Design a protein around this ligand. Structure first.
Ligand SMILES: Nc1ncnc2c1ncn2[C@@H]1O[C@H](COP(=O)(O)OP(=O)(O)OP(O)(O)=S)[C@@H](O)[C@H]1O
Ligand SMILES: Nc1ncnc2c1ncn2[C@@H]1O[C@H](COP(=O)(O)OP(=O)(O)OP(O)(O)=S)[C@@H](O)[C@H]1O
Lengths: 352, 352
C-alpha cells in the first residue's frame, strides 16, 4: 500500500521540529499526488485538478530543509532549483526550461517517469516586481520569470535537448508534459509584515480619535503572516495571474525559545551531534548540559536570523578550545558550562 | 452537414458558464471558417476576407479553458502556443516559425490539412510596450515580436524544416501559406482598467461641481472593459499595425457570486466532482450542501483572483479531514457545513 499522512509526517518529524501546519500541507499533497498519478483518467471522474504549494516563513525556519528531507523518502523524482538565475526567454542568464532538464538527469531521461515527478523552487521573493519602478524598463529577472512560469504551472510541453546533443546533426528536442507535475515554491518574503499592517491596523492616526500603537512591539510575525491573503502579495509585486496558479499557502511560524532547545537534541542531524561526531573521530567525547542550551536560545533570537544563526554562538565559544585541543594530549572528555557561553569562564577539560 | 452556432455552443456550455458574449464570437468564427473552408479558393466573392479574434478578460475568467474545449470538438487541427518564448531575429530563445512547425505535429506534416488549422496564443500582453513612446532599447520580447507577427497574420510563406531533418545534407524547408490560417491571440491585460478610466472619467476635480469617485468599488473591471477601443491599447503599448490585424474583440466579464456556485456543480470538471472522485477510490463519499457554497463564493471574490483561486478555500478546510482520513477507519461519508468553511466548526463524519 501507499504511505499515509501520519507515517510521512512521522518521518519528517525526525528531521524537522516545530512546524505543525507546514508538515500537514506537504503530506496531503504528496499523499494525493500518488492518487492522481495512479489513476490517470481511469475512474468515473475526469479532468483531475492540481494544487501547488507556496511556502512562506522567516529565515532559518525550515523551508529549504523540508524539500531536502522529502527527497529522501520520496520515490518519484525530485529536484531543487532556483529562481534567481532565470531570465525572460532569450537573455544571457538562463531559460525556464532548464528546470525540466535537471529533472531528467535524476530520472535517467525517463519521460514517462519525469512527468510524474515533483519540483521545488527556492527564493521566489527575488523575482518580485518593484511596485514603483520606472515605467520605461523591462524587469527580465522578476516580471519576465513570473510571466514565463504561468503556462508551466498550468501545463504545457517544452523542448528539452536530450543530453545536450553530440553536434548540430541531431537538432531535435523532446516534449515533456507538465500538467501533472507538482510545484512547491518557497521564499522568505522581506517587508511583507509592513504591508499587512497597513491593511489590518488601518490606524497610524496622529489625531485624538485614532488609536495610537499601544507598544513598539506589535503585529507578531507568526500571527501576522497567518492573516495573509492574495491581495497582500499584489502590493508586494507578484501578479494575480501567477498567484492563482498556487492556491495553497503555508505560513511558517518563527522559532520559539523552547523549539531551539529541541532542535539541538531531538533531530539526528543536530549541531550538537555534528560537533559530537567531529570530536568522536578525534578520540574525544563531548557534553552539552541543558543549563547551556536554554542560554543559547536567548542569544540566537537576539540575532533575529533564525536557526542558521546558531553556529555563530557555538563556534565563537568553541573557537578557543578547538584551536588548542589537537596540540593537547591525554584529554578524553570535554565539559561545557553555562558560564562558558557567557564568556566569563573557560570550559573544563577532563584528562585521561 | 456541419455544426451550428447553437449546437457548438451547447458543447461549450457543459464546460463553461457565464460567458455568453465570448461564446458567440468563437462560434461565428469557427462556423465561418468551415464555410470559408468549404470553398476551395473559389467563390463568387473572390479573395474572401479573414477576421482574427482578440480575447480580453480578467484573470481566471476562462480564456484558456475555451481553447482546450474547442480542440476536442474541433475537427481541423488546433495548437496551444504561448508568446512567452518568442524572440525576433533568430535569437536563442525561439522564433515565430516554431508555431507553424508545432502545428504540423498535430497534422502529421499535411500542408493542405494544416493551412485550414486554427491557432491560439496566450499571454499576448507580455510582448507589449510599457509606454506610447516607440522604444529606448532593442526590446526583443516586446514590440519586436509584434513586428514579426504582422506579416504572419496578413499572409506569407515561412520556411519550416520538415521533421527537423536527419542531418545537414537535406538543408531544405517547406513553404506554408498563412493568409487562410486563423489566429486567436488573447491574454489577461494588467493595468488596462486605469488607462481606460483616464479616458472616460474625464478627470477628478477637487471642487464641488466635479464628480468624485463615489465609492472605492466603482467602474468594475467588466463594465469598464466593455468600453474598450483600439486607441486605448495604443497607450498600453501595442502598435496599431498589430491591432489592425485583430479587428474583432471579445470582452469577458468577471465571475459573479451565483456564477461560482454553478461552476462547482454543473461543469463536468468541477472541483466538487474532482474531490468526490478523489474519495471515491478510497471507498468514501462526499457531500457539499448549498449553504456551504454561498459562503465559499463570497470568499473567492475577496481574493480577487477568480475561479483559479477557489482551491485555496476548499483545500484549507479539507486539509484537516484529508490528513486523518486514511488513518481513520470505518468512515464512509463526510458532510461539510457552512461553519466548516469559516473554521469555527469541524466537518461532521459518518461511521459505518
Ligand atoms: N524546524 C527545524 N528543525 C531543525 N533544524 C531546523 C529547523 N528549521 C531550520 N533548521 C536549521 O536551519 C537550517 C537551514 O534551514 P532552511 O530551511 O534553509 O531555512 P530557510 O527558511 O529555507 O532559509 P531561506 O529559505 O534561504 S531564507 C537547517 O539546515 C537546520 O540546521
Ligand atoms: N466559466 C468558467 N466555468 C468553469 N470554470 C472556469 C470558468 N472560467 C475559469 N474556470 C476555471 O479556471 C481554470 C483556468 O481558467 P483559464 O481559461 O485559465 O482562465 P484564463 O482566462 O485563461 O486566465 P489566464 O489568462 O490564464 S491568467 C479552469 O481550468 C477552470 O477550473
Amino acid at each position: 500500500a501507499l504511505p499515509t499522512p501520519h507515517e510521512i509526517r512521522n518521518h519528517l518529524d525526525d528531521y524537522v521540529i516545530g512546524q505543525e501546519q507546514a508538515k500537514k500541507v506537504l503530506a496531503v499533497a504528496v499523499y494525493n499526488h500518488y492518487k492522481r498519478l495512479r489513476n490517470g483518467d481511469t475512474s468515473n471522474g475526469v479532468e483531475l485538478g492540481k494544487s501547488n504549494i507556496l511556502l512562506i516563513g522567516p529565515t532559518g525556519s525550515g523551508k529549504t530543509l523540508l524539500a531536502e528531507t522529502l527527497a529522501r523518502l520520496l520515490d518519484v523524482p525530485f529536484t531543487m532549483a532556483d529562481a534567481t538565475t532565470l531570465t525572460e526567454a532569450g537573455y544571457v542568464g538562463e531559460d525556464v526550461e532548464n528546470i525540466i532538464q535537471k529533472l531528467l538527469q535524476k530520472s535517467d531521461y525517463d519521460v514517462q517517469k519525469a512527468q510524474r515527478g515533483i519540483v521545488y523552487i527556492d527564493q521566489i521573493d527575488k523575482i518580485s516586481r518593484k511596485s514603483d519602478n520606472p515605467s520605461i524598463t523591462r524587469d527580465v529577472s522578476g516580471e519576465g520569470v513570473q510571466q514565463a512560469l504561468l503556462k508551466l504551472i498550468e501545463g504545457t510541453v517544452a523542448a528539452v535537448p536530450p543530453q545536450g546533443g553530440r553536434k548540430h546533426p541531431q537538432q531535435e528536442f523532446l516534449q515533456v508534459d507538465t500538467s501533472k507535475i507538482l510545484f512547491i515554491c518557497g521564499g522568505a518574503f522581506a517587508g511583507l509584515d509592513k504591508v499587512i499592517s497597513h491593511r489590518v491596523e488601518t490606524g497610524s492616526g496622529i489625531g485624538f480619535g485614532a488609536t495610537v500603537k499601544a507598544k513598539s512591539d506589535k503585529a507578531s510575525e507568526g500571527e501576522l503572516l497567518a492573516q495573509v491573503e492574495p491581495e497582500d502579495l499584489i502590493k508586494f509585486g507578484l501578479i494575480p495571474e501567477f498567484i492563482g496558479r498556487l492556491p495553497v499557502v503555508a505560513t511558517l511560524n518563527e522559532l520559539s525559545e523552547e523549539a531551539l532547545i529541541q532542535i539541538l537534541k531531538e533531530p539526528k542531524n543536530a549541531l550538537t551531534k555534528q560537533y559530537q561526531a567531529l570530536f568522536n573521530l578525534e578520540g574525544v567525547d563531548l557534553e552539552f548540559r541543558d543549563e547551556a542550551l536554554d542560554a543559547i536560545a536567548k542569544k540566537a533570537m537576539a540575532r533575529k536570523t533564525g536557526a542558521r544563526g546558531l553556529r555563530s554562538i557555538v563556534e565563537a565559544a568553541l573557537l578557543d578550545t578547538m584551536y588548542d585541543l589537537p596540540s593537547m594530549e591525554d584529554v578524553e572528555k570535554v565539559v561545557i558550562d553555562e558560564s562558558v557561553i557567557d564568556g566569563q569562564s573557560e570550559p573544563l577539560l577532563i584528562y585521561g
